[PDB]
Amino acid sequence: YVSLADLERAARDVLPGEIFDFLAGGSGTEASLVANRTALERVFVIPRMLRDLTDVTTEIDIFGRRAALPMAVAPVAYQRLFHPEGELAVARAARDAGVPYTICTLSSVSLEEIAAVGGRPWFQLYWLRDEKRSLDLVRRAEDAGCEAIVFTVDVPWMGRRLRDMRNGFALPEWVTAANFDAGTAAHRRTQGVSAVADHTAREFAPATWESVEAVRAHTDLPVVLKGILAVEDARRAVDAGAGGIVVSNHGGRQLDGAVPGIEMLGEIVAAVSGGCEVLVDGGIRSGGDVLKATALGASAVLVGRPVMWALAAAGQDGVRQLLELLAEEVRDAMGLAGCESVGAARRLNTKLGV
Amino acid sequence: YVSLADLERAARDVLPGEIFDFLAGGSGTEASLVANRTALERVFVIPRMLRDLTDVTTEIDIFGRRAALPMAVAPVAYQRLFHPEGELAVARAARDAGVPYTICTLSSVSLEEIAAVGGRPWFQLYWLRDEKRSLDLVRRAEDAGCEAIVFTVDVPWMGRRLRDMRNGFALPEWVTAANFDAGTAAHRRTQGVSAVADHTAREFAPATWESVEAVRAHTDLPVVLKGILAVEDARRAVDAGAGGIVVSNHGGRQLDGAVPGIEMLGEIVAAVSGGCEVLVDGGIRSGGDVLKATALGASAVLVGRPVMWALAAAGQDGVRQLLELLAEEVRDAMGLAGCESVGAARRLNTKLGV
Amino acid sequence: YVSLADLERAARDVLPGEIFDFLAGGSGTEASLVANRTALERVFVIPRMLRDLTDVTTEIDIFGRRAALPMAVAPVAYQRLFHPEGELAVARAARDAGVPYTICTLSSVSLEEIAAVGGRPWFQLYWLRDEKRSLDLVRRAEDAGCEAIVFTVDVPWMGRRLRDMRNGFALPEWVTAANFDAGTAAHRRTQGVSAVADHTAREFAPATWESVEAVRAHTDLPVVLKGILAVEDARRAVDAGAGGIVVSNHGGRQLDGAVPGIEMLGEIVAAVSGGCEVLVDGGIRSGGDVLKATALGASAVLVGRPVMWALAAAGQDGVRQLLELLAEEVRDAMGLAGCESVGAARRLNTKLGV
Amino acid sequence: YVSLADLERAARDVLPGEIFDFLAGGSGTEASLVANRTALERVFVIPRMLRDLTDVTTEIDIFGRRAALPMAVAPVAYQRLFHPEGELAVARAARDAGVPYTICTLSSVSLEEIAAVGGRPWFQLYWLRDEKRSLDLVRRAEDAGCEAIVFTVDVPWMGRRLRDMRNGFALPEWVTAANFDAGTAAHRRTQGVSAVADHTAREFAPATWESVEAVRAHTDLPVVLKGILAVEDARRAVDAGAGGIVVSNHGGRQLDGAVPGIEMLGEIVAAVSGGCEVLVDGGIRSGGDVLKATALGASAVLVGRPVMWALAAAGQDGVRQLLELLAEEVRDAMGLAGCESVGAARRLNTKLGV
Ligand SMILES: Cc1cc2nc3c(=O)[nH]c(=O)nc-3n(C[C@H](O)[C@H](O)[C@H](O)COP(=O)(O)O)c2cc1C
Ligand SMILES: Cc1cc2nc3c(=O)[nH]c(=O)nc-3n(C[C@H](O)[C@H](O)[C@H](O)COP(=O)(O)O)c2cc1C
Ligand SMILES: Cc1cc2nc3c(=O)[nH]c(=O)nc-3n(C[C@H](O)[C@H](O)[C@H](O)COP(=O)(O)O)c2cc1C
Ligand SMILES: Cc1cc2nc3c(=O)[nH]c(=O)nc-3n(C[C@H](O)[C@H](O)[C@H](O)COP(=O)(O)O)c2cc1C
Ligand SMILES: [F-]
Ligand SMILES: [F-]
Ligand SMILES: [F-]
Numbered sequence A, B, C, D: 001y002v003s004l005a006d007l008e009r010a011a012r013d014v015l016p017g018e019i020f021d022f023l024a025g026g027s028g029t030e031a032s033l034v035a036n037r038t039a040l041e042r043v044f045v046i047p048r049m050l051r052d053l054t055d056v057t058t059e060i061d062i063f064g065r066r067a068a069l070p071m072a073v074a075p076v077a078y079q080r081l082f083h084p085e086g087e088l089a090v091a092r093a094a095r096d097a098g099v100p101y102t103i104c105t106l107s108s109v110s111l112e113e114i115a116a117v118g119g120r121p122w123f124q125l126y127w128l129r130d131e132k133r134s135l136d137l138v139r140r141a142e143d144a145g146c147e148a149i150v151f152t153v154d155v156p157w158m159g160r161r162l163r164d165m166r167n168g169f170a171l172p173e174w175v176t177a178a179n180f181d182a183g184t185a186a187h188r189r190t191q192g193v194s195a196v197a198d199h200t201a202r203e204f205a206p207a208t209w210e211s212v213e214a215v216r217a218h219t220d221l222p223v224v225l226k227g228i229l230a231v232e233d234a235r236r237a238v239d240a241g242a243g244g245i246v247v248s249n250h251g252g253r254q255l256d257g258a259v260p261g262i263e264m265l266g267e268i269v270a271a272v273s274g275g276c277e278v279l280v281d282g283g284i285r286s287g288g289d290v291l292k293a294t295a296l297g298a299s300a301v302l303v304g305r306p307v308m309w310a311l312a313a314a315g316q317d318g319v320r321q322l323l324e325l326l327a328e329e330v331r332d333a334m335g336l337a338g339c340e341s342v343g344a345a346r347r348l349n350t351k352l353g354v
């Protein structure tokens, strides 16, 4: 593979149609899904020349750990959908690459098992109807050695994914939510209905600023709010004691018509003015895209779908190859842009084009 | 049906070509028709997170009544063109959904019959060559329980619809203007001529500000001016005593090259500064589009063509399904955007994209 | 015919390929040709409502005569290329429609014959290597009753039209420059060479501000400079005593990459501040386009290619039908936009869209 | 040939696939390659009229020599890839046309042989791992009569060209770096690897501002820094004693996502404020494009790929024809825009369009 696009092709070949659709799709007309890509394509970097490149390093320090790249694996539920080794394959590859891996509330292998892989993992939290269950997950994650809580704040319920509805998508019997008894709703086949959306509408409670404070009081770990797009919500996240935010429209899967995170990133970085880490996701598909995000001010990016393409295509080895490719592309882009460090990349200027 | 687009497909299947064209088409090169869609597609919402969503309500109060959604059925003439039950089917579904229905001057079932369905209806007025006839329609509408007069101000005569001209479109014998003897002109088949345009050029008189005052003096009902695009005309509408305006280019069917209402809406909302209700129409095709209109400042939207798609596809039941779908999409979009009420949605910010 | 586009289709059917190409084409990559259309398509009108339309008039006064529309037939050389009656057919139709007709220096019927048709014609001037010949043409035009001199200032030589070069285009033996002995160069067939471009490079001299003064001193008629795009050249035209200018890139046939006139029009109208008439051409293809040009501040437009489509399709009758269609579309657009006069249309606002 | 596009067609016919790809391609997704063209297409010239054109001259003085056009042949490595006469054919044609030719560090014929052709050549420098070798090349170039050193500053290593990787591109045995023993790395065939990229990663050292000073101290010739895009790097180039810069993203072959030079040119010209020559390259494909670059403030342009198309198509004669065509297109564009000199063209204004 010489690009991430090679991997999407490989994944489409192997995965069952309804599973590829569940992975690829967005909500509504998929306007926000497409806009994530369009928004990146419009950004051009103004590279610097003639700088010392004798020791280019792509490393960052974030949430108390050194990471090999300004990148982490995004939370993606139910990874056994894509390969039998699911989360274990991805976590092993991430560990070996020095990249943080985000363990999901709806992981198909238990959070303790995935944490046991090592690699100083993060944990993604959904707020559940039973608050105590969500707080218990936080404590389990901390006890297991997770280093940050990524609280997803953009899913009071799941968006309307028309591909999943048309397919009457449901989880196969062999894929379950391993962290708790989530019941059978996500496995029920109903015509024109997404079982996964039906399941979560029952299981999830809308999170509020009060929920954030409950989590912050329950752990010493940095709390990172994922799904922030409004400048005022980014400011409030800092005031609330968040250690970071992920500027994100959830891959175009939640509100159709939500602005891409990449379009809000610069304004958000200015408003928080170093008060927390500011990550971004949505459509990152190359090292050059990582560079663009960094130049707009991101601390790091998350990558979601491409990691699943790699997992579907070739399991752990596939994810390894994807991360090695991304690492090479990041080093390449940084050097060509005159940046010996990620901090230097954050000081690059950009220009919008057509 | 999982989207309004499903309904257009269904309607194209069933309707005769020239009737689908009469419904779908616009004037001239259809630039304004396309621009209504383009304009919405360029608007992105900046959603808010972490707000209380324990009682999301899509209701509004408008013209003295509670409506279930910030939406009404737009005036569409001659609904028997699309289904034998015509206006009665649509009005029944609107009533059951709690959505205002606009009864047309050129309805194919009498305004009194449609009003008898219930649901607190509005009445759309065209200014006719005989002024007394137009004022009599206003009084009939009020006597029948209509709750607002929607005075269409953008049709001094009908625009040039090339599809209708090429088709030599005329009304079938079984469709007539039930509110008065409109003569036979709209039924006459002439090559390269639209009988409907020929008919109205004879029957309609251009309305003026004097006509608005005559209507305002003739009724206690709120007068709503439909087809306002200039900021100064919106201001003047308030000064003239209008209870509302509909910012609209008449679905791209009148002046080809007229700006979309959605492009003028924000400026108009600022200029009237709460002095009347400001509605918008043109290309609303989802709950997310309703959200965009609200975020730009609209009090409510009108929906035209999709209601006729639903009527053509499955009669009253079709319209019911369309309104249930729109209601779900509106609730979904509002919640995902952090809005427990339509007032909160009006306070959302937006960003233009490409 | 219900649109001008109908006529282009008709003309492509009948004309020989190389003649249609000579008519349709532009210079270079045809960027400016396409941009003339793109530029109009991006302009949207903000129409006014509720104004008195009891006597809509499309008439203007220009260069001392009343014209039926804010439009004239653009100068187009060698009209016998398109129909045997050539300029006489077009001039007769223009006269009957009350539209000024521009007689060309390179007309294929003598200027005196075309003037004898009546209709108070204009005369287009090219500056020739022998200055006395150009001034003699001016005097002939004035003696024959022409009412303005349209001095083309954007053809120091002909642009590079790749269609004409590839076709090895040359005039047929039966088409000649009837106003003087122009020699045989335009009739010579040479591979990969445009004989018309070769001919004019020999015959034409670049015009200068001194040439303008020589013309202004030679006639009492208003001198109109055609092909102005720079604001400073428009100002200078007023200072030089021009009665008008035509803001124009010569239909995309001269400098490839020249800005469309419609893009410079507003700025030019502001800069001249009523000091001369400001016309525009390039891509006017409907009454709505006329309205857009007027709203941007034009006194009138010229129309070129569509008049030749009509002439090729059906001779004098074809041109008559085209002008009747344009007249109807102009009246329609004006009324729908709330304008009872062309002066009111000039006060309309516009908005750029995508 | 009537346009440069004719030549690309001819070249695609004759060249082996992997060689055409090596020539045509860019790095990554080829975003910057495409953007070079898009950026030029968006620029429109505002031409002037009525100026004296009795002696239009396309000549410039640059680096102490008169050039026939505001254009030079860009450095393109390994010209024997495209025709057996390689650099000698191109240099002879450039000499005969009065256009500077840039001899490459990686020329496939020795720099002394190419210089012996005459025509007052420039020399392009890459900084090599052995600094002394690079400085020796500078001295060789000066001794051989080269008139400027074009120091390429945007290749600390070669970008990721996916076409070359997929093709497993390597130089044929009959093409070598004639200026020094470059070893065998560029000739080694490895699957999924570009031998040329592998070769240069070993051979090249990243250049720094210290390298620029070492070169400036080693020669009396003007040093021109090629690959500057940041305004601050252009300013620093002047402060460093550069005689010129080439504003360039290396034809979209280095950082994918680098802004086009044409997008930075105006800002760069303003910032240097006459302190050095400012050239631009990337996508120049006509005399009209030369005019656009000049109007944005460039001293001259470089042309790369089209010169190789011409060389592949017809050797020395092909390059001659290309330069004659470009010369004619430049003269044509300048005159149509009212410019009797390149200095006048630099004073033209431009407007962005869509
Ligand atoms: C199949 C799938 C499952 C996901 N599951 C979660 C989840 O459980 N929690 C969460 O916060 N985000 C989830 N996401 C969103 C991603 O974390 C990420 O925001 C999104 O995929 C956009 O990045 P991308 O374009 O790189 O895919 C999921 C995305 C996909 C495609
Ligand atoms: C078939 C048809 C008939 C219409 N009849 C009327 C009418 O009688 N009065 C009126 O004010 N608008 C009329 N309209 C315009 C609509 O009320 C509305 O402004 C327009 O359809 C744009 O909304 P849409 O894109 O949702 O269709 C009609 C529209 C259509 C398509
Ligand atoms: C075939 C042809 C011949 C023309 N001949 C002349 C001419 O002799 N003098 C002149 O000033 N313009 C001439 N023009 C330019 C037109 O007057 C006008 O500026 C141009 O066609 C743009 O308008 P359009 O898009 O309506 O065609 C010619 C254009 C065409 C297509
Ligand atoms: C095949 C090829 C080889 C090149 N070799 C060099 C080189 O050795 N040194 C250099 O500075 N630029 C090199 N370039 C870049 C060109 O000098 C120029 O910047 C680029 O081709 C953009 O111009 P264009 O669009 O006219 O091709 C090369 C470009 C190509 C296509
Ligand atoms: F999830
Ligand atoms: F109607
Ligand atoms: F001509």
Ligand SMILES: [F-]
Pocket: D077, D106
């Ligand atoms: F190279």
